[PDB]
Design a protein around this ligand. Structure first.
Ligand code: NI
Length: 156
């Protein structure tokens, strides 16, 4: 009746590493984010797709991205009544910290998941699940790749 609170749904995909970060959403609370720590010995482009299915309230907090504490613009690829899909590509050349946040309150951010991706050795882990039941799959499942195969038609 009242104990449910705000339950946002968040999934974060490293499409360029074939890593899905499934259900990084706080189990309860009007906030979303994730700290991804990257072990990297050479130059590579990382492509991020973030899928937000916000709780049915009518004031959705925007999501932001920092890379090594530098703000990076998220493209909004898709928005409807259900979900927002954002994307970014960035180049990194050494051990990096990706921060997705909606908030700066330590009382929110300390509850976001902390994820480790090791490109060198092809290792990942949940260092800290925060206040989430986050989990990971590699490769990404085709039935999660939601962003047509029947021949063309003459539109004048
Ligand atoms: Ni309740």
């Amino acid at each position: 009746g009242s104990h449910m609170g705000v339950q946002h749904k968040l999934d974060i995909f490293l499409v360029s590493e074939g890593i899905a970060i499934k259900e990084a959403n706080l189990l309860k609370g009007d906030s979303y984010g994730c700290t991804i720590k990257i072990k990297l010995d050479k130059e590579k482009t990382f492509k991020f797709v973030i899928v937000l299915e916000p709780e049915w309230i009518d004031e959705i907090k925007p999501i932001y991205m920092k890379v090594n504490d530098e703000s990076v613009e998220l493209e909004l690829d898709y928005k409807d009544a259900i979900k927002r899909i954002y994307s970014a590509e960035v180049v990194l050349s050494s051990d990096s910290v990706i921060n997705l946040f909606s908030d700066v309150d330590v009382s929110y951010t300390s509850e976001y998941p902390t994820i480790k991706v090791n490109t060198i050795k092809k290792y990942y882990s949940v260092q800290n699940r925060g206040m989430t039941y986050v989990h990971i799959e590699s490769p990404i499942n085709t039935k999660d790749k939601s962003w047509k195969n029947g021949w063309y038609e003459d539109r004048t």
